[PDB]
Amino acid sequence: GTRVFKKSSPNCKLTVYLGKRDFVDHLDKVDPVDGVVLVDPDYLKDRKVFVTLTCAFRYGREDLDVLGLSFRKDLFIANYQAFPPTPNPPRPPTRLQERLLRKLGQHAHPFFFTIPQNLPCSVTLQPGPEDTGKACGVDFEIRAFCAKSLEEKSHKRNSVRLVIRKVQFAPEKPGPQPSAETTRHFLMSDRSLHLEASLDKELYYHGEPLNVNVHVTNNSTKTVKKIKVSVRQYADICLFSTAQYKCPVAQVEQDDQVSPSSTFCKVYTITPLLSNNREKRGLALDGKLKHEDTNLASSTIVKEGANKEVLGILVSYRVKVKLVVSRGGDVSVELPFVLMHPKPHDIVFEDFAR
Numbered sequence: 001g002t003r004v005f006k007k008s009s010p011n012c013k014l015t016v017y018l019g020k021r022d023f024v025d026h027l028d029k030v031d032p033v034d035g036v037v038l039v040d041p042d043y044l045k046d047r048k049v050f051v052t053l054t055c056a057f058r059y060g061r062e063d064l065d066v067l068g069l070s071f072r073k074d075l076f077i078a079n080y081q082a083f084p085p086t087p088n089p090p091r092p093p094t095r096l097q098e099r100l101l102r103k104l105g106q107h108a109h110p111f112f113f114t115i116p117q118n119l120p121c122s123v124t125l126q127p128g129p130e131d132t133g134k135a136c137g138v139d140f141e142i143r144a145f146c147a148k149s150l151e152e153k154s155h156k157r158n159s160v161r162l163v164i165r166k167v168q169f170a171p172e173k174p175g176p177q178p179s180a181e182t183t184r185h186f187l188m189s190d191r192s193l194h195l196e197a198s199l200d201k202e203l204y205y206h207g208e209p210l211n212v213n214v215h216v217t218n219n220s221t222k223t224v225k226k227i228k229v230s231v232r233q234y235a236d237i238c239l240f241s242t243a244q245y246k247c248p249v250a251q252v253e254q255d256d257q258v259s260p261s262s263t264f265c266k267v268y269t270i271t272p273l274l275s276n277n278r279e280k281r282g283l284a285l286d287g288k289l290k291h292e293d294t295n296l297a298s299s300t301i302v303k304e305g306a307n308k309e310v311l312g313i314l315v316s317y318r319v320k321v322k323l324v325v326s327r328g329g330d331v332s333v334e335l336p337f338v339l340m341h342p343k344p345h346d347i348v349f350e351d352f353a354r
Contacts, residue, residue, distance in 0.1 A: 001347065001348060002099075002346060003348050004018065004019060004347055004348065004349055005017065005018045005019070005020075005349075005350060006018075006349050006350075006352055007351070007352040009156070009160045011158060014039045014144060014146070014158065014159070014160055015038040015039075016035060016036075016037050016160050017035055017036045017100060017108075017349075018034075018164075018352070019094070021352065021354065022166075022293075023115065023140075023167070024166075025117055025121060025166055026117075027117060027169075027170055027301065030116070033112055033113040033114070033142075033164070034110070034111075035112070035142075036097060036101065036104070036109065036110050036111065037051060037108065038105060039083075039146060040107065043146050043158075044148075046148060047147055047148050048149070049082045049083045049144075049145070049146045050079055050081060050082065050146065051082050051142065051143070051144045052077065052141075052142065052143035053076075053077070053078040053079075053113040053115070053140070053141075053143075054074070054076070054140070054143065055075045055115075055120075055138065055141075056072055056073060056074050056075055057071075057072065057073040057137075057138050057239055058071070059071040059136035059239065059241065061135060062124070062137065063139075063163075068134070071240040073312075075119060075312075076116065076119055082144075083109045090114075093110045097110050099347060100347070103347060111144075113142075115140075118306035119166070119306070120311045120313075121167060121298060122166050122167065123138050123297045123300075123313050123315065124137035124284070124297070125284050125313060126282070128279065128280070128281040128282050131243075131281075131282045134241075136241075136312070137285075138311075138313070139163055142164060143159055143160065143161055144159060145160065162352055167298065168298040168299075168341050169341050169342075170338070173202070175202060176202075177198045177199055177200065177202070178202050178319070178337050179198075181196065181197050181198070181321070181335050182194075182196055182333075183331065183332070183333050185331045187221065187222055187325075187327070187329060188221070191219050192219055193216075193217075193218050194218070194219070195214075195215075195217075195331050196214070196333075197319075197321045197335060199211070199213070199337055202337055203338045204338070204339050205342035206298075206340075206341060208342075210269070210337070211267050211268070211270075212267065212268040212321060213265075213267045214229070214264075214265065214266055214267070214321055215264070216258050216264040216323065218260060219261060221260050222260065222327040222329075223257065223259060223260060223325070224256075224257055224259075224324065225257060226255075226257070226323075227253065227254070227258075227321070227322070228253045228324060229251070229322075230248045230250060230319070230322075231249055231250040231251075232248050232249070232334075233246070233248075233284060233315065233316070234246055234317070235282070235297070235316075236314040237314075238308075238311060238312060239312050245284070247283055249296055250273070252268050270319070272317075272339065274294060284296070284313060285297050286341070288354075291354045292354065293354055295341070297315040298339060298341050299316055299338040299340065300313075300314055317337055317338065318336050319334065319335045320332060320335075321333050321334075
C-alpha cells in the first residue's frame, strides 16, 4: 500500500519517518518536508527534541565527514521544535502525517521544513586517477536529536543523521531544436567538408533517449572513416578549488563512412545513463555512487534568485558529433542540451538508507 521511510538513532531511541527520499524542485517551489519523529521513554522531559535541516557545500571527503574536510560552506539551516510543538505555522499535517500520528505514540510529533528553490540540488563528485582534486558536492542533511536547547548537541549517539535528495525538475518548453550545428573545414584547397546536426528537443529527462540528426556534405578530397556520436558532461567546481571535469557519459558509433564528393545523412539515437558507465571518473552525480537510485547530475538551472559561486558545482551537457578523417584532421560540432530529473513519472515501513 503506502510506503514510509524510517531511520533511527544508533541508540534506537529516536526514530524519523518520511514519505519521500527525494524532493523535487519545480523551479516555482519545492516539495515539502513533512515528517514525524519518535522518542519513546522520557528524553529528557527537561530536554527538548529538535530537528535540523541543513544544506552545505563540502569539499575534501564526502559526508560532512570531519576527517579530510578541507572546506565547507553553509547554504541554509533550519530548526524548529518538534516537542514541545509551536504556534508556527503552516502546521496542517499532510494526510500521511496524520495517519502516522495515530499509528504511533502520543510522543510522535510532526515536523516540517520548507526549502528555497534558489538552493543548489543534490550533487556529488569524486575525481578519477585522480584528477588531483578531492571529492566534493552539495548535501541536504536532516538531523534530529534532544537537548535542553539548540546550542547544545550530541555526537550521533542520541541524534539521527540522514541525507535527502533535492532533484531538479523542469518542463519541456517549446522552441527551436537544439540549434543545429553547422561547420565547414577546408582541409588544403577550396573544397569543403560540411557538417550539420540537430537534436529533437532542447530538454531531456533521465532515461529519455535523444535522436541526433546528422548531415554530411563532403565535397572535400579526404574520406570520413568513421562517425562517432557522444554525450559529454561538463562539471565546474566553483568553490575553493576551481577545477573542470569534462567527460563523455555516452557514446555511439557504427560502420559509417563518407566519400569525397558524397553526401550522407542519418539519425543516431543516444542515451546517457550513469548505469552505462563503469568508471565514475570525475563525474557529477546527484547522490552517492554506490546507490542504485543515483543518476548523472541534472543540468544546473539558469539559477533563479541566489546565483553565483553558491551553487558549488556547475553541471551541464553537450552532444558531440565527430567525423574521423583519414588523411587526417577531425571535423566536429557540439549541441548543448539540458538534462532534467524526470517527473512524467496500509502504511508499510521500508528502511530509509538506500
